[PDB]
Design goal:
The PDB classes it as oxidoreductase/oxidoreductase inhibitor. With 435 residues, the protein is α+β, with helices and mostly antiparallel strands. It has a single domain, classed as Cytochrome p450 (Orthogonal Bundle), CATH 1.10.630.10. The chain binds protoporphyrin IX containing FE (HEM) and 1-[3-(4-chloro-3,5-dimethylphenoxy)benzyl]-1H-imidazole.
Length: 435
Protein backbone atom coordinates (compact mmCIF):
# COMPACT_ATOMS: atom_id res chain seq x y z
CA UNK A 1 0.00 0.00 0.00
CA UNK A 2 2.91 2.32 -0.70
CA UNK A 3 3.22 0.85 2.75
CA UNK A 4 3.31 -2.38 4.73
CA UNK A 5 0.62 -5.09 4.63
CA UNK A 6 -2.06 -5.34 7.33
CA UNK A 7 -1.03 -6.11 10.93
CA UNK A 8 -2.62 -8.21 13.68
CA UNK A 9 -3.78 -6.96 17.14
CA UNK A 10 -1.55 -7.83 20.11
CA UNK A 11 -3.85 -8.41 23.09
CA UNK A 12 -0.97 -9.48 25.37
CA UNK A 13 2.16 -7.61 24.25
CA UNK A 14 5.79 -8.39 23.57
CA UNK A 15 4.83 -12.00 23.52
CA UNK A 16 3.51 -11.42 20.02
CA UNK A 17 1.20 -14.24 18.94
CA UNK A 18 3.35 -17.18 20.00
CA UNK A 19 0.77 -17.78 22.75
CA UNK A 20 -2.23 -18.74 20.60
CA UNK A 21 0.15 -19.83 17.87
CA UNK A 22 2.08 -22.59 19.61
CA UNK A 23 -1.00 -24.66 20.41
CA UNK A 24 -2.17 -24.82 16.81
CA UNK A 25 -0.61 -22.67 14.13
CA UNK A 26 -3.04 -23.91 11.49
CA UNK A 27 -6.16 -23.06 13.45
CA UNK A 28 -4.48 -19.75 14.12
CA UNK A 29 -2.90 -18.79 10.82
CA UNK A 30 -6.25 -19.42 9.12
CA UNK A 31 -8.07 -17.11 11.53
CA UNK A 32 -5.82 -14.17 10.65
CA UNK A 33 -5.96 -14.58 6.87
CA UNK A 34 -9.77 -14.68 6.94
CA UNK A 35 -9.96 -12.10 9.75
CA UNK A 36 -7.42 -9.71 8.21
CA UNK A 37 -9.22 -9.92 4.88
CA UNK A 38 -5.83 -10.76 3.36
CA UNK A 39 -3.91 -13.85 2.34
CA UNK A 40 -0.82 -11.85 3.22
CA UNK A 41 -0.35 -10.12 6.61
CA UNK A 42 2.12 -9.16 9.35
CA UNK A 43 2.29 -10.50 12.91
CA UNK A 44 3.97 -9.46 16.13
CA UNK A 45 6.43 -11.92 17.68
CA UNK A 46 8.45 -10.55 20.60
CA UNK A 47 7.91 -7.07 19.17
CA UNK A 48 9.46 -8.33 15.92
CA UNK A 49 7.40 -7.79 12.75
CA UNK A 50 6.66 -11.14 11.11
CA UNK A 51 5.00 -10.99 7.69
CA UNK A 52 3.50 -14.34 6.66
CA UNK A 53 2.94 -14.88 2.90
CA UNK A 54 -0.24 -16.96 2.74
CA UNK A 55 -1.64 -16.26 -0.71
CA UNK A 56 -0.38 -18.98 -3.02
CA UNK A 57 -0.33 -16.75 -6.07
CA UNK A 58 2.41 -14.88 -4.36
CA UNK A 59 4.93 -17.59 -3.48
CA UNK A 60 7.07 -16.35 -6.34
CA UNK A 61 7.63 -13.08 -4.47
CA UNK A 62 9.03 -15.04 -1.53
CA UNK A 63 11.20 -17.65 -3.25
CA UNK A 64 12.64 -15.67 -6.16
CA UNK A 65 14.81 -12.92 -4.64
CA UNK A 66 18.49 -13.68 -4.02
CA UNK A 67 19.80 -13.97 -0.45
CA UNK A 68 21.33 -10.47 -0.44
CA UNK A 69 17.74 -9.21 -0.69
CA UNK A 70 16.06 -11.91 1.37
CA UNK A 71 18.61 -13.60 3.64
CA UNK A 72 17.86 -16.92 5.38
CA UNK A 73 21.08 -16.83 7.42
CA UNK A 74 19.46 -14.85 10.22
CA UNK A 75 16.78 -17.45 10.88
CA UNK A 76 19.10 -20.37 11.42
CA UNK A 77 21.52 -18.58 13.66
CA UNK A 78 20.31 -21.27 16.03
CA UNK A 79 22.53 -24.01 14.69
CA UNK A 80 25.78 -22.30 13.70
CA UNK A 81 27.49 -24.43 16.40
CA UNK A 82 25.87 -27.64 15.14
CA UNK A 83 27.55 -27.36 11.72
CA UNK A 84 30.46 -25.12 12.67
CA UNK A 85 31.22 -21.44 12.11
CA UNK A 86 31.49 -21.05 8.33
CA UNK A 87 29.38 -24.08 7.48
CA UNK A 88 25.84 -23.96 6.07
CA UNK A 89 24.06 -20.86 7.27
CA UNK A 90 27.09 -20.12 9.33
CA UNK A 91 29.16 -19.72 6.15
CA UNK A 92 29.01 -16.69 3.80
CA UNK A 93 26.58 -16.97 0.86
CA UNK A 94 29.34 -17.36 -1.69
CA UNK A 95 30.75 -20.22 0.40
CA UNK A 96 27.35 -21.43 1.60
CA UNK A 97 26.49 -21.41 -2.11
CA UNK A 98 29.54 -23.48 -3.03
CA UNK A 99 28.79 -25.97 -0.25
CA UNK A 100 25.22 -26.46 -1.47
CA UNK A 101 26.67 -27.49 -4.84
CA UNK A 102 28.99 -30.02 -3.23
CA UNK A 103 26.11 -31.74 -1.47
CA UNK A 104 23.96 -31.40 -4.59
CA UNK A 105 26.53 -33.11 -6.82
CA UNK A 106 26.50 -35.93 -4.26
CA UNK A 107 22.76 -36.56 -4.38
CA UNK A 108 22.12 -36.26 -8.10
CA UNK A 109 20.41 -39.21 -9.79
CA UNK A 110 23.88 -40.04 -11.14
CA UNK A 111 24.84 -41.57 -7.77
CA UNK A 112 21.47 -43.31 -7.29
CA UNK A 113 22.18 -46.64 -9.01
CA UNK A 114 23.26 -48.96 -6.16
CA UNK A 115 20.91 -46.97 -3.90
CA UNK A 116 17.66 -48.71 -4.90
CA UNK A 117 18.93 -52.24 -4.07
CA UNK A 118 20.99 -50.89 -1.16
CA UNK A 119 17.62 -49.72 0.15
CA UNK A 120 15.48 -52.83 -0.35
CA UNK A 121 18.20 -54.67 1.59
CA UNK A 122 18.47 -52.50 4.69
CA UNK A 123 14.73 -52.37 5.35
CA UNK A 124 14.14 -56.07 4.75
CA UNK A 125 16.68 -56.62 7.48
CA UNK A 126 15.11 -54.30 9.99
CA UNK A 127 11.76 -55.95 9.82
CA UNK A 128 13.18 -59.40 10.43
CA UNK A 129 15.02 -58.12 13.45
CA UNK A 130 11.81 -56.47 14.60
CA UNK A 131 8.69 -57.62 12.82
CA UNK A 132 9.78 -61.12 13.58
CA UNK A 133 6.31 -62.45 14.33
CA UNK A 134 3.13 -62.67 12.22
CA UNK A 135 1.33 -60.19 14.46
CA UNK A 136 2.90 -57.33 16.40
CA UNK A 137 2.45 -53.93 17.98
CA UNK A 138 5.00 -51.39 16.78
CA UNK A 139 5.32 -47.61 16.92
CA UNK A 140 5.60 -46.44 13.31
CA UNK A 141 7.07 -42.99 13.97
CA UNK A 142 9.94 -44.76 15.77
CA UNK A 143 10.21 -47.74 13.42
CA UNK A 144 10.34 -45.32 10.49
CA UNK A 145 12.72 -42.86 12.15
CA UNK A 146 15.10 -45.81 12.24
CA UNK A 147 14.75 -47.28 8.76
CA UNK A 148 15.26 -43.86 7.24
CA UNK A 149 18.49 -43.37 9.17
CA UNK A 150 19.46 -46.94 8.27
CA UNK A 151 18.83 -46.83 4.54
CA UNK A 152 20.33 -43.34 4.19
CA UNK A 153 23.57 -44.45 5.82
CA UNK A 154 23.44 -47.63 3.75
CA UNK A 155 23.32 -45.22 0.81
CA UNK A 156 25.77 -42.43 1.66
CA UNK A 157 28.18 -44.26 3.96
CA UNK A 158 31.16 -46.34 2.83
CA UNK A 159 31.50 -49.95 3.95
CA UNK A 160 34.54 -49.02 6.02
CA UNK A 161 32.77 -46.02 7.59
CA UNK A 162 29.68 -48.02 8.36
CA UNK A 163 31.90 -50.50 10.14
CA UNK A 164 33.17 -47.83 12.48
CA UNK A 165 29.76 -46.29 12.88
CA UNK A 166 26.39 -47.90 12.74
CA UNK A 167 23.15 -46.11 11.98
CA UNK A 168 22.08 -46.67 15.58
CA UNK A 169 25.16 -45.00 17.01
CA UNK A 170 25.20 -42.23 14.45
CA UNK A 171 21.52 -41.43 14.94
CA UNK A 172 21.98 -41.34 18.72
CA UNK A 173 24.63 -38.71 18.03
CA UNK A 174 22.45 -36.61 15.81
CA UNK A 175 19.91 -36.90 18.56
CA UNK A 176 22.65 -35.84 20.92
CA UNK A 177 23.47 -32.75 18.88
CA UNK A 178 19.80 -31.88 18.29
CA UNK A 179 18.37 -31.89 21.80
CA UNK A 180 20.10 -28.58 22.24
CA UNK A 181 17.20 -26.81 20.48
CA UNK A 182 14.13 -25.12 22.05
CA UNK A 183 11.03 -23.61 20.43
CA UNK A 184 11.65 -19.90 21.19
CA UNK A 185 15.13 -19.51 19.68
CA UNK A 186 14.94 -17.80 16.27
CA UNK A 187 13.16 -14.89 17.97
CA UNK A 188 15.81 -13.81 20.49
CA UNK A 189 25.55 -23.53 27.56
CA UNK A 190 26.31 -27.03 28.90
CA UNK A 191 24.21 -28.13 25.91
CA UNK A 192 26.67 -26.36 23.61
CA UNK A 193 29.20 -28.50 25.48
CA UNK A 194 27.25 -31.69 24.79
CA UNK A 195 26.63 -30.42 21.28
CA UNK A 196 30.33 -29.80 20.73
CA UNK A 197 31.23 -33.07 22.46
CA UNK A 198 29.05 -35.32 20.30
CA UNK A 199 30.43 -33.32 17.37
CA UNK A 200 34.12 -33.21 18.30
CA UNK A 201 33.78 -36.95 18.87
CA UNK A 202 32.40 -37.47 15.37
CA UNK A 203 34.82 -34.93 13.89
CA UNK A 204 37.63 -37.06 15.28
CA UNK A 205 36.17 -40.45 14.32
CA UNK A 206 35.90 -39.22 10.74
CA UNK A 207 39.49 -38.05 10.58
CA UNK A 208 40.70 -41.48 11.63
CA UNK A 209 38.56 -43.07 8.92
CA UNK A 210 40.45 -40.71 6.60
CA UNK A 211 43.88 -41.73 7.89
CA UNK A 212 42.97 -45.28 6.85
CA UNK A 213 41.56 -44.27 3.46
CA UNK A 214 44.58 -42.34 2.20
CA UNK A 215 47.09 -44.81 3.52
CA UNK A 216 45.49 -47.10 0.99
CA UNK A 217 32.79 -42.89 -3.93
CA UNK A 218 30.53 -42.06 -0.96
CA UNK A 219 29.32 -38.74 0.44
CA UNK A 220 32.42 -38.46 2.62
CA UNK A 221 34.87 -39.32 -0.16
CA UNK A 222 32.93 -37.06 -2.51
CA UNK A 223 33.28 -34.10 -0.16
CA UNK A 224 37.03 -34.83 0.09
CA UNK A 225 37.69 -34.34 -3.62
CA UNK A 226 35.67 -31.14 -3.25
CA UNK A 227 37.49 -27.99 -4.38
CA UNK A 228 36.33 -24.44 -3.71
CA UNK A 229 36.35 -21.71 -6.36
CA UNK A 230 39.77 -20.55 -5.30
CA UNK A 231 41.21 -24.01 -5.16
CA UNK A 232 40.79 -24.14 -1.42
CA UNK A 233 39.48 -27.28 0.20
CA UNK A 234 37.33 -28.20 3.17
CA UNK A 235 38.79 -28.55 6.65
CA UNK A 236 37.72 -31.71 8.48
CA UNK A 237 35.62 -29.23 10.47
CA UNK A 238 33.74 -27.96 7.44
CA UNK A 239 33.50 -31.50 6.12
CA UNK A 240 32.08 -32.86 9.38
CA UNK A 241 29.25 -30.33 9.44
CA UNK A 242 28.33 -30.96 5.80
CA UNK A 243 27.75 -34.64 6.56
CA UNK A 244 25.73 -33.68 9.64
CA UNK A 245 23.73 -31.06 7.73
CA UNK A 246 23.02 -33.60 4.98
CA UNK A 247 22.02 -36.22 7.54
CA UNK A 248 20.08 -33.77 9.68
CA UNK A 249 18.15 -32.27 6.77
CA UNK A 250 16.81 -35.64 5.67
CA UNK A 251 16.35 -37.28 9.06
CA UNK A 252 13.08 -36.02 10.50
CA UNK A 253 11.57 -34.68 7.29
CA UNK A 254 11.87 -38.03 5.53
CA UNK A 255 10.79 -40.38 8.32
CA UNK A 256 7.72 -38.25 9.17
CA UNK A 257 6.82 -38.26 5.48
CA UNK A 258 7.15 -42.03 5.44
CA UNK A 259 5.19 -42.32 8.66
CA UNK A 260 2.33 -40.20 7.32
CA UNK A 261 2.25 -41.95 4.00
CA UNK A 262 1.99 -45.33 5.73
CA UNK A 263 -0.58 -43.95 8.21
CA UNK A 264 -2.84 -42.78 5.39
CA UNK A 265 -2.46 -45.96 3.41
CA UNK A 266 -3.13 -48.48 6.20
CA UNK A 267 -6.48 -46.74 6.67
CA UNK A 268 -9.72 -48.44 5.60
CA UNK A 269 -11.16 -45.15 4.35
CA UNK A 270 -8.10 -45.20 2.09
CA UNK A 271 -8.36 -48.72 0.60
CA UNK A 272 -8.90 -47.91 -3.10
CA UNK A 273 -5.60 -46.04 -3.06
CA UNK A 274 -3.85 -48.93 -1.40
CA UNK A 275 -5.52 -51.03 -4.11
CA UNK A 276 -4.06 -48.73 -6.77
CA UNK A 277 -0.76 -48.86 -4.88
CA UNK A 278 -0.86 -52.60 -5.57
CA UNK A 279 -1.77 -52.78 -9.23
CA UNK A 280 1.47 -50.83 -9.20
CA UNK A 281 3.83 -52.85 -6.98
CA UNK A 282 2.43 -56.29 -7.85
CA UNK A 283 4.20 -57.31 -11.07
CA UNK A 284 7.50 -55.97 -9.78
CA UNK A 285 10.04 -58.41 -8.42
CA UNK A 286 11.61 -58.56 -4.96
CA UNK A 287 14.66 -57.19 -6.75
CA UNK A 288 14.13 -53.51 -7.52
CA UNK A 289 16.22 -51.56 -10.02
CA UNK A 290 16.52 -47.83 -10.67
CA UNK A 291 14.06 -48.02 -13.59
CA UNK A 292 11.46 -49.53 -11.27
CA UNK A 293 11.06 -46.82 -8.64
CA UNK A 294 11.99 -43.87 -10.86
CA UNK A 295 9.86 -44.46 -13.95
CA UNK A 296 7.27 -46.98 -12.85
CA UNK A 297 6.02 -45.91 -9.45
CA UNK A 298 4.30 -42.69 -10.44
CA UNK A 299 1.12 -43.25 -8.43
CA UNK A 300 3.17 -43.96 -5.31
CA UNK A 301 4.91 -40.64 -5.86
CA UNK A 302 1.56 -38.88 -5.64
CA UNK A 303 0.90 -40.38 -2.22
CA UNK A 304 4.17 -39.15 -0.74
CA UNK A 305 3.67 -35.64 -2.16
CA UNK A 306 0.07 -35.53 -0.96
CA UNK A 307 1.21 -36.53 2.52
CA UNK A 308 3.76 -33.73 2.45
CA UNK A 309 1.06 -31.49 1.03
CA UNK A 310 -1.45 -32.25 3.79
CA UNK A 311 1.00 -32.16 6.70
CA UNK A 312 4.18 -30.33 5.69
CA UNK A 313 7.03 -31.07 8.16
CA UNK A 314 8.46 -27.55 7.86
CA UNK A 315 5.61 -25.19 8.71
CA UNK A 316 7.51 -21.96 8.15
CA UNK A 317 10.19 -21.01 5.68
CA UNK A 318 11.74 -17.72 6.78
CA UNK A 319 13.89 -14.87 5.50
CA UNK A 320 15.29 -11.54 6.67
CA UNK A 321 14.15 -8.54 4.64
CA UNK A 322 17.48 -6.76 4.21
CA UNK A 323 15.71 -4.65 1.58
CA UNK A 324 12.17 -3.69 0.61
CA UNK A 325 10.29 -5.83 -1.90
CA UNK A 326 6.78 -5.52 -3.35
CA UNK A 327 4.44 -8.39 -2.55
CA UNK A 328 1.13 -8.28 -4.39
CA UNK A 329 -0.43 -4.95 -3.47
CA UNK A 330 1.74 -4.49 -0.37
CA UNK A 331 5.36 -3.65 0.41
CA UNK A 332 7.88 -5.13 2.85
CA UNK A 333 10.08 -2.66 4.76
CA UNK A 334 13.75 -3.39 5.47
CA UNK A 335 14.02 -5.03 8.89
CA UNK A 336 10.92 -7.19 8.57
CA UNK A 337 11.00 -10.94 9.05
CA UNK A 338 9.17 -12.34 6.04
CA UNK A 339 8.03 -15.96 5.99
CA UNK A 340 6.09 -18.35 3.77
CA UNK A 341 4.17 -21.23 5.30
CA UNK A 342 3.61 -24.53 3.48
CA UNK A 343 1.12 -25.55 6.20
CA UNK A 344 -1.03 -22.46 5.72
CA UNK A 345 -0.52 -22.45 1.93
CA UNK A 346 -1.46 -26.10 1.48
CA UNK A 347 -4.80 -25.29 3.03
CA UNK A 348 -5.83 -22.37 0.88
CA UNK A 349 -9.11 -23.69 -0.53
CA UNK A 350 -8.67 -22.33 -4.06
CA UNK A 351 -5.51 -24.40 -4.47
CA UNK A 352 -6.69 -27.30 -2.31
CA UNK A 353 -10.42 -28.00 -1.88
CA UNK A 354 -10.97 -30.06 1.30
CA UNK A 355 -7.38 -29.38 2.36
CA UNK A 356 -7.67 -31.93 5.21
CA UNK A 357 -8.83 -34.67 2.84
CA UNK A 358 -6.03 -36.95 1.67
CA UNK A 359 -6.18 -37.19 -2.11
CA UNK A 360 -3.20 -38.60 -4.06
CA UNK A 361 -4.87 -37.93 -7.42
CA UNK A 362 -5.56 -34.30 -6.54
CA UNK A 363 -3.56 -31.65 -8.38
CA UNK A 364 -2.87 -28.06 -7.29
CA UNK A 365 -5.47 -25.69 -8.71
CA UNK A 366 -3.07 -22.80 -8.37
CA UNK A 367 0.29 -23.46 -9.99
CA UNK A 368 2.96 -23.12 -7.29
CA UNK A 369 0.56 -23.74 -4.44
CA UNK A 370 2.52 -26.77 -3.26
CA UNK A 371 5.84 -25.88 -1.57
CA UNK A 372 6.65 -28.97 0.51
CA UNK A 373 10.17 -28.89 -0.88
CA UNK A 374 10.47 -25.14 -1.14
CA UNK A 375 10.67 -23.24 -4.36
CA UNK A 376 12.70 -20.72 -6.22
CA UNK A 377 16.26 -19.90 -5.32
CA UNK A 378 15.97 -22.40 -2.48
CA UNK A 379 14.26 -25.53 -3.69
CA UNK A 380 15.10 -28.72 -1.79
CA UNK A 381 18.26 -30.37 -3.07
CA UNK A 382 17.31 -33.55 -1.23
CA UNK A 383 13.92 -33.89 -2.88
CA UNK A 384 14.90 -36.58 -5.42
CA UNK A 385 16.66 -38.63 -2.77
CA UNK A 386 13.93 -38.41 -0.16
CA UNK A 387 11.38 -39.54 -2.69
CA UNK A 388 13.50 -42.50 -3.77
CA UNK A 389 13.82 -43.72 -0.21
CA UNK A 390 10.19 -43.27 0.62
CA UNK A 391 8.80 -44.80 -2.55
CA UNK A 392 11.01 -47.88 -2.28
CA UNK A 393 10.18 -48.32 1.40
CA UNK A 394 6.41 -48.08 1.03
CA UNK A 395 6.81 -50.60 -1.76
CA UNK A 396 9.15 -52.82 0.24
CA UNK A 397 6.93 -52.79 3.32
CA UNK A 398 3.54 -53.07 1.63
CA UNK A 399 4.62 -55.98 -0.57
CA UNK A 400 5.37 -58.36 2.32
CA UNK A 401 2.90 -56.89 4.84
CA UNK A 402 -0.57 -55.54 5.55
CA UNK A 403 -1.29 -52.90 8.19
CA UNK A 404 -3.79 -51.63 10.74
CA UNK A 405 -3.92 -48.60 13.01
CA UNK A 406 -4.85 -48.86 16.68
CA UNK A 407 -7.14 -45.94 16.09
CA UNK A 408 -10.11 -44.51 14.28
CA UNK A 409 -8.46 -41.28 13.12
CA UNK A 410 -5.04 -40.83 11.61
CA UNK A 411 -2.85 -39.02 14.10
CA UNK A 412 -2.86 -35.31 14.63
CA UNK A 413 0.11 -33.13 13.85
CA UNK A 414 2.08 -32.24 16.99
CA UNK A 415 2.92 -28.55 16.65
CA UNK A 416 5.34 -28.37 19.61
CA UNK A 417 8.40 -29.38 17.60
CA UNK A 418 10.48 -27.26 15.20
CA UNK A 419 9.92 -30.07 12.70
CA UNK A 420 6.30 -31.24 12.77
CA UNK A 421 5.21 -34.88 12.45
CA UNK A 422 2.23 -37.02 13.47
CA UNK A 423 1.50 -37.28 17.21
CA UNK A 424 3.92 -39.87 18.58
CA UNK A 425 1.61 -41.55 21.12
CA UNK A 426 -0.95 -42.19 18.37
CA UNK A 427 1.31 -44.05 15.98
CA UNK A 428 1.23 -47.49 17.57
CA UNK A 429 0.32 -49.75 14.67
CA UNK A 430 -0.12 -53.51 14.26
CA UNK A 431 0.93 -55.66 11.29
CA UNK A 432 -0.39 -58.80 9.64
CA UNK A 433 2.44 -60.39 7.65
CA UNK A 434 1.24 -61.46 4.21
CA UNK A 435 2.30 -64.86 2.83
C1 LIG B 1 10.69 -35.54 2.04
C2 LIG B 1 11.29 -34.87 3.01
C3 LIG B 1 11.69 -33.46 2.85
C4 LIG B 1 10.90 -32.24 3.06
C5 LIG B 1 9.46 -32.10 3.48
C6 LIG B 1 11.91 -31.19 2.74
C7 LIG B 1 11.56 -29.76 2.81
C8 LIG B 1 12.41 -28.66 2.37
C9 LIG B 1 12.02 -27.21 2.31
C10 LIG B 1 10.70 -26.58 2.67
C11 LIG B 1 13.23 -26.51 1.83
C12 LIG B 1 13.42 -25.03 1.59
C13 LIG B 1 13.59 -24.32 2.93
C14 LIG B 1 13.66 -22.83 2.71
O1 LIG B 1 12.99 -22.33 1.78
O2 LIG B 1 14.37 -22.15 3.48
C15 LIG B 1 14.25 -27.57 1.64
C16 LIG B 1 15.61 -27.33 1.15
C17 LIG B 1 16.79 -28.15 1.46
N1 LIG B 1 16.70 -29.46 1.71
FE1 LIG B 1 14.99 -30.44 2.10
N2 LIG B 1 13.16 -31.63 2.38
C18 LIG B 1 13.04 -32.99 2.47
C19 LIG B 1 14.09 -33.95 2.11
C20 LIG B 1 15.51 -33.66 2.16
C21 LIG B 1 16.61 -34.68 2.17
C22 LIG B 1 16.53 -36.18 2.15
C23 LIG B 1 17.83 -33.84 2.21
C24 LIG B 1 19.23 -34.32 2.25
C25 LIG B 1 19.75 -34.95 1.21
C26 LIG B 1 17.39 -32.42 2.20
C27 LIG B 1 18.30 -31.27 2.26
C28 LIG B 1 17.96 -29.88 1.92
C29 LIG B 1 18.98 -28.84 1.76
C30 LIG B 1 20.48 -28.95 1.90
C31 LIG B 1 18.19 -27.66 1.43
C32 LIG B 1 18.74 -26.29 1.18
C33 LIG B 1 17.76 -25.42 0.42
C34 LIG B 1 18.41 -24.06 0.42
O3 LIG B 1 18.69 -23.55 1.53
O4 LIG B 1 18.67 -23.51 -0.67
N3 LIG B 1 15.94 -32.28 2.16
N4 LIG B 1 13.76 -28.91 1.92
C1 LIG C 1 22.42 -24.55 3.83
C2 LIG C 1 22.51 -25.93 3.98
C3 LIG C 1 21.46 -26.64 4.55
C4 LIG C 1 21.55 -28.02 4.71
O1 LIG C 1 20.53 -28.75 5.26
C5 LIG C 1 19.68 -28.03 6.04
C6 LIG C 1 20.13 -27.40 7.20
C7 LIG C 1 19.23 -26.69 7.99
C8 LIG C 1 17.89 -26.61 7.65
C9 LIG C 1 17.44 -27.25 6.49
C10 LIG C 1 16.10 -27.20 6.13
N1 LIG C 1 15.73 -28.49 5.52
C11 LIG C 1 15.33 -29.58 6.18
C12 LIG C 1 15.09 -30.54 5.29
N2 LIG C 1 15.33 -30.04 4.07
C13 LIG C 1 15.73 -28.77 4.21
C14 LIG C 1 18.34 -27.97 5.70
C15 LIG C 1 22.69 -28.68 4.28
C16 LIG C 1 23.75 -27.98 3.71
C17 LIG C 1 24.88 -28.66 3.30
C18 LIG C 1 23.65 -26.60 3.56
CL1 LIG C 1 24.94 -25.69 2.86
Amino acid sequence: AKKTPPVYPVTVPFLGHIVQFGKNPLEFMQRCKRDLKSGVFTISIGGQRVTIVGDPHEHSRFFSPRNEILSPREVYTIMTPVFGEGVAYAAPYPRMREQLNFLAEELTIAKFQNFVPAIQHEVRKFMAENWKEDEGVINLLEDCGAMIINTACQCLFGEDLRKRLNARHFAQLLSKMESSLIPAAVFMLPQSARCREARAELQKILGEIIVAREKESDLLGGLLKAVYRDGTRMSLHEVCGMIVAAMFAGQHTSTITTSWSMLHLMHPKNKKWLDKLHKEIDEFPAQLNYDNVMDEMPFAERCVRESIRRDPPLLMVMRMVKAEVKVGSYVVPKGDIIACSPLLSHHDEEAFPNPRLWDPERDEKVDGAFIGFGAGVHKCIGQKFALLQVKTILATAFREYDFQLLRDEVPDPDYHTMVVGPTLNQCLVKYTRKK
